């Protein structure tokens, strides 16, 4: 990494590493929560992105790999290309940061793709976990806005957020794109806006996203489309915390698989249960440690009991286990993800130092403070959420 600040106040962050593939992008604190409803932000930025590239033909002809990632509190755009495409990439990034609303016709196309997201394979289990965690574990009801519209619901263009991107953009890129970015940021207006971004407080709500899944998802006849998903959320820490390595470790102890304690006691434990995973999700100022279970609707309560059984188990944990966890823990996309969050990249030498350096103190501490809370409970399916909640007392 190489930080700079421009003449006009614009932050610029460069990825060190070899030449070959060129990288440019923009990261900025506008996410799904900055629009009145689900998908509003997503479709707005998608529209803007597709206009900025002129056409899919131009994208193709220059061999440019664009990536747009819209999160709850923040979003990023990345472009990857070979040096002979620099002009088109830079110009396309420039158009994206120009404040101009995309034409309605484009919005209507993007709306169509959005409504078809599950069918097209853009709305997988990872995406559903995030949605479930965000509609359940926040005091603020804005976090419930995801990126993928329900079949019954409106999606509107948010032209205000387009005006705001240039006013809060940090630029990102590979080291060899220094000159080109300095000039691009040079063209943005002085000086970047400064808002206070506080991640909303933990609340253990109980919710259902009770919705039919498509049979076909991408090219797969989904083996999970008839099962339910249960998400259990507890508060953890922000990416910048000194406890964040401890929590990464704690997630791997729990672990999980399809067909580690979540594998052995939860996937092994309930028959007709596809998979069970524990993840740690960081936000601007907070975290959510979450455990997810794909099982038959009727099996969710039993599954919860095995997770409670699983939490219990972590106090009396061996060093063989505690070392395995330390062990077990588009690289530009990680550079950008971890550039906003202000932390150390998952691939960096410093990050894996931290992982070696987690005590058993740190882990049991993290366990104690996290599981002290009543979990938030979300269901993709018709399962009564308070029933699963009862399991936790």
């Amino acid at each position: 990494c190489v930080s700079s600040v421009l003449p006009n106040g614009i932050h610029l962050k460069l990825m060190k590493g070899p030449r070959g593939v060129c990288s440019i992008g923009a990261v900025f604190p506008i996410g799904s929560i900055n629009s009145p409803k689900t998908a509003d932000t997503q479709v707005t930025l998608s529209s803007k992105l597709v206009e900025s590239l002129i056409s899919p033909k131009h994208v193709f002809m220059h061999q440019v790999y664009p990536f747009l990632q819209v999160n709850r509190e923040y979003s990023y755009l990345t472009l990857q290309f070979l040096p002979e495409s620099t002009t088109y990439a830079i110009e396309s990034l420039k158009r994206f940061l120009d404040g101009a609303a995309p034409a309605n016709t484009t919005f209507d196309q993007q709306k169509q793709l959005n409504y078809a997201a599950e069918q097209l394979g853009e709305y997988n289990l990872l995406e559903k976990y995030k949605d479930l965690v965000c509609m359940s574990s926040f005091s603020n009801k804005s976090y419930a806005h995801g990126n993928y519209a329900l079949q019954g619901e409106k999606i509107d263009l948010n032209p205000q957020i387009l005006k705001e991107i240039p006013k809060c953009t940090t630029l990102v890129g590979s080291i060899d794109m220094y000159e080109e970015l300095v000039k691009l940021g040079g063209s943005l207006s002085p000086f970047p806006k400064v808002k206070l971004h506080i991640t909303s407080n933990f609340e253990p709500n109980h919710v259902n996203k009770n919705v039919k899944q498509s049979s076909l998802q991408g090219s797969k006849i989904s083996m999970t489309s008839s099962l339910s998903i249960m998400s259990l959320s507890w508060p953890s820490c922000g990416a910048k915390s000194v406890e964040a390595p401890a929590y990464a470790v704690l997630s791997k102890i729990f672990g999980g698989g399809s067909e580690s304690l979540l594998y052995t006691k939860v996937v092994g434990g309930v028959a007709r249960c596809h998979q069970a995973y524990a993840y740690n999700n960081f936000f601007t100022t907070g975290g959510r440690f979450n455990i997810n279970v794909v099982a038959e609707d009727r099996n969710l309560v039993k599954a919860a009991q095995l997770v409670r059984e699983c939490i219990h188990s972590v106090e009396t944990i061996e060093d063989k286990n505690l070392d395995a966890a330390r062990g077990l823990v588009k690289r530009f996309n990680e550079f950008v993800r971890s550039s906003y969050l202000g932390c150390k990249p998952i691939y960096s030498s410093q990050y894996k130092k931290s992982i070696k350096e987690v005590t058993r103190k740190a882990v049991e501490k993290a366990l104690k403070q996290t599981f002290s809370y009543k979990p938030a409970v979300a269901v993709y399916g018709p399962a009564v959420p308070n029933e699963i909640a009862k399991v936790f007392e």
Binding site: P56, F60, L82, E84
Partner: protein, 416 residues
């Protein structure tokens, strides 16, 4: 990460060839590349190459399944393997200090297995499950159907084997495949690494101390001429009503062998049609609203298959087929041939450049290059060949392979 020239190959007195290519970085990818896969099978042992790959991974004497698990968990040795129609590899990606354990385990598993009925029978279910999983990706299914109707020869077998085959594979069959395909003379050990050649060489020598040299060299079972492939265009339609209002479609042509002068042109043409992604579609495609598109082109001994596929709504299927045929046609037009070539060439260079930043990708390419080529082709000479490729080379590929040729076609429909 690779400085765009040339590998270094040494042969141990036990006949194991050690090919390394230099790279900058903390990372090292290493393992065994074996010319073993479903092309070299027949009706009676179909599936056996893939089956063997599993058995090998299920541990041997010096490393049972248990010590392999420990090696993942505590010592940072992660074992990867795979079987294509044409080749097989077992590999690990490691930090340089783990070199000796890695070369030891790998040599031991690949070159020294313990193939017993109990491991064989115990593996059957795993392979059955994998076959079910794979059958629920319709892209895999349609890929396979398209091969099946195009090749009466061994390429038309699925890699995993038909359901009945997976069920009938005996320990004798697994043994035999190992005995016939896993010999020093049918494989290479590969290393993409900063470590010097000699350090890898010496490590592999330590690792292969148990291995006795070959007395003789019976003609390799993997020999291309023992498995002549025959493409015949065929058209077949399937039901899958669980797909609902969707169909999958694939269209195939014979493609050139790896060494044909027309191979590179074939790669350029396929690339210029390419794949439709979220934000990119070929200038050649007229209806950019098509739901999806993939293009692949592979060499198989004397033959090969170029294939285009995707899925659309039932209403949109027939349109999809017209779009794909138009797009190919468009390339041959003199108004277009020159732009098609340049954009296709750019595509190929761009695919290259991406592969040259992952040691895993360098490894696979080096392994396959060594096993499947007449003579090793440099990333260097390859670039020259691409660049020297002209409008007439494209015209000629069209002439031998496309114009007036029947394509194979498979449709898998939800309602039809």
């Amino acid at each position: 990460i690779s400085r765009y020239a040339v590998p270094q190959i040494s042969k141990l007195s036990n006949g194991v060839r050690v090919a390394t290519i230099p790279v900058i970085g903390e990372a090292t990818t290493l393992g065994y590349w074996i010319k073993s896969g479903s092309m070299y099978e027949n009706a009676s042992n179909s599936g056996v190459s893939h089956y063997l790959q599993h058995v090998i991974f299920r541990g041997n004497e010096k490393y049972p399944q248990r010590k392999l698990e420990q090696l993942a968990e505590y010592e940072g040795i992660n074992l990867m393997a795979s079987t294509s129609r044409v080749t097989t590899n077992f590999n690990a990606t490691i930090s340089n200090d783990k070199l000796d354990v890695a070369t030891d385990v790998l040599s031991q598993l690949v070159l020294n297995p313990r193939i017993k009925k109990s491991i064989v029978d115990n593996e059957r279910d795993t392979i059955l499950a994998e076959e079910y999983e794979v059958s629920q990706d319709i892209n895999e299914v349609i890929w396979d159907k398209l091969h099946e109707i195009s090749f009466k020869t061994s390429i038309g077998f699925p890699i995993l084997g038909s359901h009945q085959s997976i069920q009938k594979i005996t320990t004798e069959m697994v043994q035999s495949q190992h005995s016939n395909f896993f010999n020093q003379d049918n494989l290479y050990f590969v290393a993409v690494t900063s470590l010097p050649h000699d350090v890898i060489l010496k490590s592999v020598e330590k690792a292969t101390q148990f291995l006795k040299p070959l007395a003789s060299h019976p003609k390799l079972a993997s020999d291309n001429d023992l498995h002549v492939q025959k493409f015949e265009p065929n058209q077949k339609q399937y039901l899958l009503p669980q797909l609902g209002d969707n169909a999958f479609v694939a269209i195939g042509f014979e493609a050139p062998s790896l060494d044909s002068p027309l191979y590179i042109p074939s790669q350029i043409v396929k690339s210029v049609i390419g794949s439709k992604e979220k934000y990119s579609v070929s200038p050649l495609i007229e209806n950019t609203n098509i739901r999806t598109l993939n293009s692949y082109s592979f060499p198989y001994g004397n033959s090969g298959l170029t294939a285009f596929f995707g899925n659309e709504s039932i209403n949109n299927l027939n349109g999809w087929v017209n779009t794909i045929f138009q797009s190919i046609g468009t390339i041959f037009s003199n108004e277009n041939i020159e732009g098609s070539l340049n954009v296709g060439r750019l595509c190929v260079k761009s695919q290259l450049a991406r592969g040259l930043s992952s040691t895993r990708t360098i490894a696979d390419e080096l392994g396959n290059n060594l096993l499947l080529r007449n003579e090793y082709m440099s990333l260097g000479k390859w670039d020259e060949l691409l660049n020297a490729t002209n409008i007439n080379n494209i015209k000629e590929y069209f002439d031998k392979y496309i114009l007036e040729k029947n394509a194979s076609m498979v449709i898998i429909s939800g309602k039809q």
